[PDB]
Design a protein around this ligand. Sequence first.
Ligand SMILES: CC[C@H](C)CNC(=O)CP(=O)(O)[C@H](CC(C)C)NC(=O)[C@H](Cc1c[nH]c[nH+]1)NC(=O)[C@H](Cc1ccccc1)NC(=O)OC(C)(C)C
Length: 329
Amino acid sequence: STGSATTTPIDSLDDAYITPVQIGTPAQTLNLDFDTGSSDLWVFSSETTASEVXQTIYTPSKSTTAKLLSGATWSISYGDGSSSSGDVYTDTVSVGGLTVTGQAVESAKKVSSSFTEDSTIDGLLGLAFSTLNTVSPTQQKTFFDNAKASLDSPVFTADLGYHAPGTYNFGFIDTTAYTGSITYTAVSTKQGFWEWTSTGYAVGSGTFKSTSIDGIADTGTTLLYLPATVVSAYWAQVSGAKSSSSVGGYVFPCSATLPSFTFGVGSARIVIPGDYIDFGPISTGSSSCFGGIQSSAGIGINIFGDVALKAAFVVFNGATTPTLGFASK
Ligand SMILES: CC[C@H](C)CNC(=O)CP(=O)(O)[C@H](CC(C)C)NC(=O)[C@H](Cc1c[nH]c[nH+]1)NC(=O)[C@H](Cc1ccccc1)NC(=O)OC(C)(C)C
C-alpha cells in the first residue's frame, strides 16, 4: 500500500505546516503538525480542559473502533517551552489513503498557552524514532513504524513548499518531484533523532569550507540553527545585518537582496535561495526583518528546520539501518 497527502503553511510566514489526518469510525478529520523532531501522535479532545480549547477535537466515545489503553499516561515538553499531557486510546488512523489499525492516539487532558493560542493546529504527528515516545509504562510506536509491514517500501518523503502547498508521501519515491539524483548519508539514532553530519558550507558565491556539522532533520522547527562562527560568516556578507539582544537574533533591512547559503551532503550540494533566508518583518510594516539562519549556541544542537528542508526533496529511509536522502528540486 501507499499514501499521499497535501501539507499547507498555517500563515503567511511559513511558521509551520498542517496535514489532514482521519481518526476513528466514522472518520473524524483533524489538521496535525507532522514533526520529524518528536515521536508522539497527540490531539485536542473531548477530554481537554474547556478553558484551554479555542481547534477541531477528537471524541473517542463517537468512534466504534476506539479502545482505552488501560494504565497508560503521557507528558511532553518542547524546546520552545510548550507542553501537554493526558491518557491513551488505540484507533484506526488514515493519512492520504494509507490506513493503520491499532495506532496509539494520545488524548490531551491539558495543553500549554502557546497551543491554545494557535487556532490552526489540532495536535502533532511525530515521525522521529519510537525511543523518544513519552507514553508510560510502555512506549508506543509512531504511525510510520506501524505502517512499515504493509508499505510498498519502508520510506516516507517530505516536499515542503515556499509560501505554497506541498506533499508528504508514504511507501514510494515520486521520481517527477525532484531534479538530478538523491544522495544518501548515514544516520545516528543514539539520541532518537534523524541525526547526520553535513560535510561543510559556502556563503553566496564564495568558497566551500570543509568543516563537519553534526545536526538533526526537524520538520517541527521553523528556522536553520548552525554554529556561531558559521552564522557570523553568513551575516558578515549582509551590510545592514546586526545581532539584536532585545529582538533575540540577527536582524537586517527588509530591502536587502540576501546571498544564498549552500550545505554539503557527502559530495553533493543543496542551495538555499537568499529569499528563503528572509523570514519576514519583525512586525507588519516594519523596515527591519528577522533572519532565517541563527546561532545554535543557546539550543546546544544544530537544527536543519523548515528554512533548509523546504529547499530540498527529503527521503526518510526507515530500513533497519536508516539513512537520509537529499535531492535538489
Ligand atoms: C521528546 C521531546 C522532543 C525531543 C522534543 N523535540 C523538540 O522540542 C523539537 P520539535 O521540532 O519537536 C518542536 C515542535 C513544536 C510544535 C513545539 N519545535 C520547537 O520547540 C521549536 C524550538 C526548538 C527546537 N529545538 C530547540 N528549540 N519551535 C519552533 O521552531 C516554532 C514552531 C511553531 C511555530 C508556529 C506554530 C507552532 C509551532 N517556531 C518559532 O519559535 O519560530 C520563531 C523563532 C520564528 C518565532
